[PDB]
Design a protein around this ligand. Structure first.
Ligand code: 53O
Ligand code: 53O
Ligand code: 53O
Ligand code: 53O
Ligand code: MG
Ligand code: MG
Ligand code: MG
Ligand code: MG
Ligand code: MG
Ligand code: MG
Ligand code: MG
Ligand code: MG
Lengths: 466, 453, 466, 453
């Protein structure tokens, strides 16, 4: 089976015929504009901490340093017990860290009977899905750790006491949640970023190449939650090369690359009723009092609206639209037709790296497993042998832990041992296509037919056809 | 990697060390007592139909014949539009049949825009999970087909009119659901079964062998939703061989193979608050106002009485439940034997599809976003569609219980959720030692399965 | 039947036994703190207009002047056709004004077939219920009027054109909606108010009298959506008299008058899940990082939380609580027990005035109606008389119009001719008690039993018992 | 103010100038043809019960007897808890009866916290609006009472068990609803009625008088949901007197009193898209593949054919509908005669309550927020409660159709919404000229009714 090389690959959950794609839609933040790691995370982490201290948190916080090897995306915060939880598709605990203490094993059941959380309880548990939640993920584990080991504060089941003031893990998390928000919305994250774009934002000469090739076979639009003043600063940088689409061609502005540009979308509300469609005034940045209810005829920039507006303006409907982005929405659904989805998952490059330069650890595990099969090979329910496998067992735990440590300290984004993460299952739900970058579409023709990979059940994967 | 034979295998979702199991718990109906197919299904189908007619349904119903090649387990009935839906793990439609007309293609979006349903809407959709829903699965498609194509009746979006008497499918479905229930609780399904046990119920000389070996290494209990009178008749037949545990050994009675026997359990409530524990009088069959045999109670009662904790108990059964500590689970899935058969006696169809797929990879091999080539692959496409269609038909007309095309069924996902272990019959434990350690198979994401080290 | 005098009366929709009331809860804005009319409305109207122009609206707007005799509360804006609608309990049009043009009669059915709106369509129609919507009510009728009669703009069914820009009535209204919000939230309404409190805010020496008498028989709390810095400035002023509860008693601070003080409630969310309960730091104004999960022991000020929190802290539940306020919420409902309601309706004083000093117009109408009864008295279906009543008819229209003009130009808040307004019906739904001011509770004992008045159907009111 | 006599009065919600009316439209069932009470209700009750038994309900049902003093119209059935609810205009509980046990007091909040329901939840609650729901109103309270108090059955929050066969009230209610429907559409209600018209249907020598006077000043049409065969039999009886319009005049046939006759109308759909207009053959009774008599069609069809516009049409009927121009409405409410009777033959009870209320006003007269007085008024309270209770009982056991205590019913509010005019019988139009101008009564808010000029 011919397969393109791993770093260039688009992966398929649900089959998609590209020939039938009429529009390519793009998310900006963390899609078109990939923020540099760990630079950008650290910046958010710093501004958030500074925001917390200024509104009254201890000053020891001022000396925390974002550590990129702790968090993985998709962890669950238990606001009742203050834990960071890695869980599987169904709610089973995989990892449970209180501060920097990984609680593990039997001592879990005193707080999680059946090692299980009822994920539906969107009041107790908060899923940290987005790449913007990386800073607050590490930060939460920091605060819990700080307050736990600080003598001026008394540790309790659900929070901490100081005097006759109590600070629940729920309240602290709200402070944190509110701090990040503020930093993105009133704080200096945006300006600190644009003041030093080459430190924070990746740029790639194939980006214009791809989008211009895309525009030759179908329409292309931009639908971002950011505002125009910011989008502009960003989109200008992403396109600032001494050339245009290819080396040798003259530099065109980034607006030229889009049949439709929309900002202030307010996704996810966008995909439902949305907001009123308005039009931005490029000179001032403010909105025009009137809009332009007319058809596609572009030097125009839109604000707000709805996904249906896009479909009206480009004269397409959902199944003909490929939406490209970093964020996992939900449902699929509600009576209007929905777009197909290409999910960008940046962590995928490191994930794939481990899956290759650590071949040695997999074939040990392979062989260790082979070896067990043998120890039990000629046995059945009549036999009384209790073969000692406790030496083999503990060896497995070390090779997998050593493998885990390669990802980060909360392990792989997708897997832990045999089990898939809740994240892995959200991806396989929401995403038709996925890859490390959307740029990988450069290595496939627009006539390509993406065929879904077969996810096999145990009885499928361990049983041969002949 | 050494692997036992396919029909003998226990399959693993979550790893389990059998060494650390203290008790084996057993479901009776469709677990210990496997009803013969298609005989039993047919019996239920008839008894159900006759009940419907007795309470006013047309007499044309009386001439339906249960057809075991139509239904598969785990289908979803839409009471709004009257469709049987095969959907995937997340709610995407795979198959949509109205009566016996299989709708899907573009014309699906007229009723399911986005080809998608919300399982959440228990008011609208009903998942037919259990082996007892097999008759009514077929019956539902029969009635919709009948009323739809009978000139005495005019078809509507959400039901049918008799004159301008209107019957919603929601109302019809409830009648059908109520008829089955009636048949099991007030009807003659149980007695017609015990009156002909060899016609309706499988029996295996290995059942005593397993349960006795199990009792040598741990406690064994029976926790069934049936009553004692039925259980007695059923458990007696199941153990009625001229020998005991093994050939040559004297016949022991079936109560002797169980440290604890419990009936009238009322699962799923059993696993929650349960009921008041009562004690059965064997002689009378009635309840009283060690020497074994309880009624009602709760899963805690079991744990108290045998002195076990949740994680030390392997519960064996055919039913997929939901979710104070909980048991490990061995799920029995009878269809698996036939499911595995197709996966084996059809190697030729799989390696065609394989080969057919390879071929595509070539046609696009040296291409990228600069290429202008649109290679015509429609003969390949149409060929692929036919081979998978032929492959489906081997399963039944609603296709495989677990998968359809590239996708897993909602049923498959429930298994991978609820079951630690699963196999075709629990008897396959006969082929593994009680020191065995079951290691979970890795379910791979696309980027894992299509990328080598 | 002994009845207290009209200006002092509390009116009853649903009976209430006051003896069984354990807590009095208070809204601040437009309840405890009554803003002066038309002073305050005008101020909002000015700041809103100035906000609109600054973001690009025509400058002619700068010369509008809030006219207090136009708006009534509870009108409905049709964002599709740009109309202000006065409707009845069921959706029937009573008044329909496009700009300052009252469309009236038969010409209504071209836009409203059956003279009826489907009130449920919370996408098309927007109810202007709150006393804060008075400025924008008049302003909307102004803009529609301005744009209609201005030659640079082309009037259309659903908006206006300028060039190839279109401004729908929906978009304009959103601008307006957003402008008011901004003015309350980022603008200078709050500061302009506190800089001149005696111009904007009523103060009354019986306010402390009532609340202190209330505190002798049950607990009293404050639950406002405003923040502490503002509440303080306001509550201080409301209580700034040279004395305390009565003349002769020493001045106590306003906090002393409340068993519980809560700000930032975020009503209506408050009455549901609410927010996390936090505690305000009086010195700084900011929130304490920790709270105080302890029982009622007061020098404390709370922020956020939920209505249940109040019930926990005061150890009461809903039917034992009388909530006093200016805003009409909804449903009754959701499984927690709900408080009883005293609705403050300031306009009630003018409403009652007309109902008294215009006795002359009612007894004319009385007599004119009497007179008809006679013209038809000795007739039945056999008789062929077509008595000319067209002189009498048109006389009625003038006396009722002259009566209407006494209220404002959109008429009575509650009534029009025979019909009740949608507002009247919202009051009778949500309010157990109502009056012009909550201060009227001063004239009733805490042992008083409020007996609901009987709202009679036609066959009840026009048929005697003997 | 001159006012005609109470039993003769037309009451006005929205003003209407009769002078400007071009057409009179007539509903037949329970409008033109008023069925006798309690005879007709009882007939429906029996036929319904017998249907239920035939499809499997206990035989104890066969000995129920319709009791006309229990139900009033406009009650709300809660299919979740099995309660009959009398609620006010906004959803507040007034009366709550489970079987024949009237629950309300504090013990209501255990099921209705805030003593409140959301009418919005058509999935849970069913408003029993029509005069045809009177039998099933009583029947529903009978069944709940029976299953609740019968030892063969165990009571649950949402239903009852027969053994551990479970029946939700939702399911029961649908059966009851379906039984009534069946009885009207496939059952023998119609034929048992026409076989004894003098027992079941009122007739008035004034019906021709009115309709003929109406035809002298405007068009008259008949728009009924019944078929021609039934309508014929019914309309013939209604007009069967030895004279015509007045005594002395020769008998004209009933078709002659109508410019347009329409059957099989399918209201409410009639008022929307309706159906295809068809034409009836009088001779055959069947449909054909001026001289009058249509089937189906739409309200526009009426307007087209008579050349009228919506606002020019007075539609006369017993049914409260909802909501391309619309008709004015005369709503017939038979119960109004008895409702008005109590409001008159019980002056003594009203002026006691009056007086009792006056008395309270005195006890608090010279009091204010400074007073320490807590005057004991509990004997007055308890006396008030009894007098209103006695007053209720005059209506029935669910009290007045329109009000209960100070509050208006949900039924009363629907009337004030849907009806421009209402009266006990449409015959009361006989007492007003066609030049009459109906002026709406003013419904007053508390501050209006308790404050004089
Ligand atoms: C639940 C799901 C998966 C596993 C699992 C996965 C890989 C290896 C092992 N394992 C367990 C004991 N030795 C190796 C367990 C354990 C528990
Ligand atoms: C969802 C589930 C299965 C499939 C699928 C399975 C096998 C082959 C194909 N396929 C799609 C186009 N040509 C072949 C699709 C596509 C989408
Ligand atoms: C709808 C509701 C009320 C009225 C109404 C109320 C008071 C007086 C009148 N009126 C109508 C003709 N002359 C006096 C009408 C008209 C239409
Ligand atoms: C709601 C509906 C009616 C009533 C009511 C009617 C008549 C008398 C009374 N009443 C209340 C306390 N004492 C007499 C209440 C109260 C609340
Ligand atoms: Mg993004
Ligand atoms: Mg990253
Ligand atoms: Mg079973
Ligand atoms: Mg389990
Ligand atoms: Mg307020
Ligand atoms: Mg005012
Ligand atoms: Mg009728
Ligand atoms: Mg009407």
């Amino acid at each position: 089976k011919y397969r393109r090389e791993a770093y260039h690959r688009v992966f398929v959950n649900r089959s998609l015929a590209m020939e039938k794609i009429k529009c390519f839609g793009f998310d900006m933040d963390y899609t078109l504009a990939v923020y540099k790691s760990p630079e950008y995370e650290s910046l958010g982490f710093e501004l958030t901490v500074e925001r917390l201290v200024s509104i009254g948190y201890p000053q020891e916080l001022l000396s925390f340093a974002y550590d990129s090897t702790f968090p993985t995306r998709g962890l669950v915060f238990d606001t009742l017990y203050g834990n960071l939880l890695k869980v599987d598709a169904y709610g089973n605990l995989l990892v449970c860290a209180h501060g920097f203490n990984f609680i593990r094993g039997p001592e879990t059941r005193e707080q999680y009977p059946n090692k299980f959380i009822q994920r539906d309880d969107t009041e107790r548990f908060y899923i940290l899905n987005t790449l913007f939640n990386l800073p607050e993920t590490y930060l939460l584990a920091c605060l819990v750790d700080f307050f736990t080991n600080c003598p001026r504060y008394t540790s309790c089941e659900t929070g901490f006491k100081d005097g006759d003031l109590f600070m629940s893990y729920r309240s602290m998390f709200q402070d944190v949640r509110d701090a990040v928000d503020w930093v993105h919305y009133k704080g200096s994250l945006k300006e600190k970023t644009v003041e030093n774009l080459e430190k924070y934002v990746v740029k790639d000469g194939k980006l214009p190449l791809l989008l211009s090739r895309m525009k030759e076979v179908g329409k292309v639009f931009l639908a971002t939650n950011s505002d125009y003043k910011y989008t502009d600063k960003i989109m200008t940088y992403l396109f600032d090369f001494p050339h245009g689409p290819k080396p040798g061609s003259s530099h065109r502005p980034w607006q030229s690359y889009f049949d439709l540009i929309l900002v202030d979308a307010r996704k996810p509300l966008f995909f439902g009723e949305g907001t009123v469609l308005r039009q931005v005034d490029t000179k001032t940045g403010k909105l025009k009092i009137g809009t332009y209810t007319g058809p596609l005829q572009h030097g125009i920039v839109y604000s707000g609206g709805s996904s249906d507006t896009i479909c009206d303006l480009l004269g397409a409907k959902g199944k003909d639209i490929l939406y490209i982005g970093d964020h996992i929405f939900g449902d699929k659904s509600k009576k209007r037709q929905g777009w197909r989805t290409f999910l960008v998952i940046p962590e995928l490059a490191q994930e794939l790296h481990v899956w290759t330069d650590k071949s040695s650890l997999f074939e040990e595990l392979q062989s260790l497993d082979i070896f067990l099969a043998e120890l039990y090979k000629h046995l059945d329910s009549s036999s009384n042998e209790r073969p000692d496998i406790s030496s083999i067992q503990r060896r497995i735990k070390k090779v997998t832990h050593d493998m885990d440590m390669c990802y980060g300290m909360m392990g792989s984004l997708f897997r832990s041992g045999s089990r898939q993460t809740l994240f892995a299952s959200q991806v396989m739900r929401y995403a038709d296509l996925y890859a490390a970058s959307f740029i990988n579409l450069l290595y496939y023709p627009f006539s390509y037919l993406f065929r879904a990979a077969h996810v096999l059940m145990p009885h499928e994967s361990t049983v041969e056809h002949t």
